[PDB]
């Protein structure tokens, strides 16, 4: 039996980056040569492993994480990066071994008038630890006075929408990302 990579790469909808999905992949043979040879990927960067010389290996567990981000945010899906996405949404470890795969999905995830389904966390007190997922929606307190769930001055809703529109610039367009880490 093959690995369910089509179930991940060709999934109908992707998750918001803040609520990124993780697919546990075990007990299957995978053909990563079929993956790399697909010229339909904008980003295919591997860390700690050569991309082509990957088919003949043996790892205990493989994780396929996937989400949507902006074009200009794809560079943040890499070890030792800083920024909104890497600090507050999806963090890779510094000693990451695995691959980051991405491709433009403007014709799937952007809608006229804005697709407000995809979100990202704008506010968080501390940075995420590697492979941490924060899905809370509590009002972010930015001053001394507590918020008690009322948005206002110094009281900010933590998630914001990308509003993907087909006429966006490439840097603001939606990109689908698949992060393969090898245990």
């Amino acid at each position, epitope marked *: 039996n093959l690995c369910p990579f089509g179930e991940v790469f060709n999934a109908t909808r992707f998750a918001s980056v803040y609520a990124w999905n993780r697919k546990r992949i075990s007990n299957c043979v995978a053909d990563y040569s079929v993956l790399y040879n697909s010229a339909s990927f904008s980003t295919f960067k591997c860390y700690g492993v050569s991309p082509t010389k990957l088919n003949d290996l043996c790892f205990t567990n493989v994780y396929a994480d996937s989400f949507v981000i902006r074009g200009d945010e794809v560079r943040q899906i890499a070890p030792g990066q800083t*920024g*909104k996405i890497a600090d507050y949404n999806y963090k890779l470890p510094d000693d990451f071994t695995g691959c980051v795969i991405a491709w433009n999905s403007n014709n799937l995830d952007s809608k006229v008038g804005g697709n407000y389904n995809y979100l990202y966390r*704008l506010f968080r007190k*501390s940075n995420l630890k590697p492979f941490e997922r924060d899905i809370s929606t509590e009002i972010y*307190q930015a001053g001394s006075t507590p918020c008690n769930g009322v948005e206002g001055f110094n009281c*900010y809703f933590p998630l914001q929408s990308y509003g993907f529109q087909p006429t*966006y*610039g490439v840097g603001y367009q939606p990109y689908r990302v698949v992060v393969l880490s090898f245990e």
Partner: antibody
Amino acid sequence: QVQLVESGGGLIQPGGSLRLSCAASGLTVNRNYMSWIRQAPGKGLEWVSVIYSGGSTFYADSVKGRFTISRDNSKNTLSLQMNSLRAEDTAIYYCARDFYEGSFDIWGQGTMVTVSS
Amino acid sequence: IQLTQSPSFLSASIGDRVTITCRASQGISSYLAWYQQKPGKAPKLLIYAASTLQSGVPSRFSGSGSGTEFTLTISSLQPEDFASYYCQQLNSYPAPVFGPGTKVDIKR
């Protein structure tokens, strides 16, 4: 109530160092996107540096490796260490709070930095 | 990405309908803010997210646009509205961009 008060501006020769401070009240520095913005006499606004609530720091290319942003949580202050100061660094320096993707609602009064030999 | 601001200088009278334009070299949706600045003062936030009026700013100010063409509109200019006005590109860390500015002076 809510305000940011700058201090530390002054006269300095090229290659010297200066340290700016931003004493905040009505907002918590380390819970906010805090930024430094400068304006040369008669010129426009130029963003200088930001520090995230999470600790990440970023800098405009014209100050990278010379300026260092930081904060003191016990005194609720924002700072800017300016090294290797050049004549073109002459400006009024504002600290501001970014509450939505770069929108600065609270600004300091500004402090003047003059770099001349 | 670069921001141009038109016109550079503008002469208006008390009670006029003033429109200021900001142009972005790429489609940035609603990620724009507008500031007013008077000589020797810090900027003052007027609009953010292209059209949201910042609290405490008079209602005669409004912003509109999306993509590349943005406008700041003062529907009935008042004597304290004679100032300079700047647009800003939002969601552009690590390099925010400010427009060159528009100076509005008293027509005579």
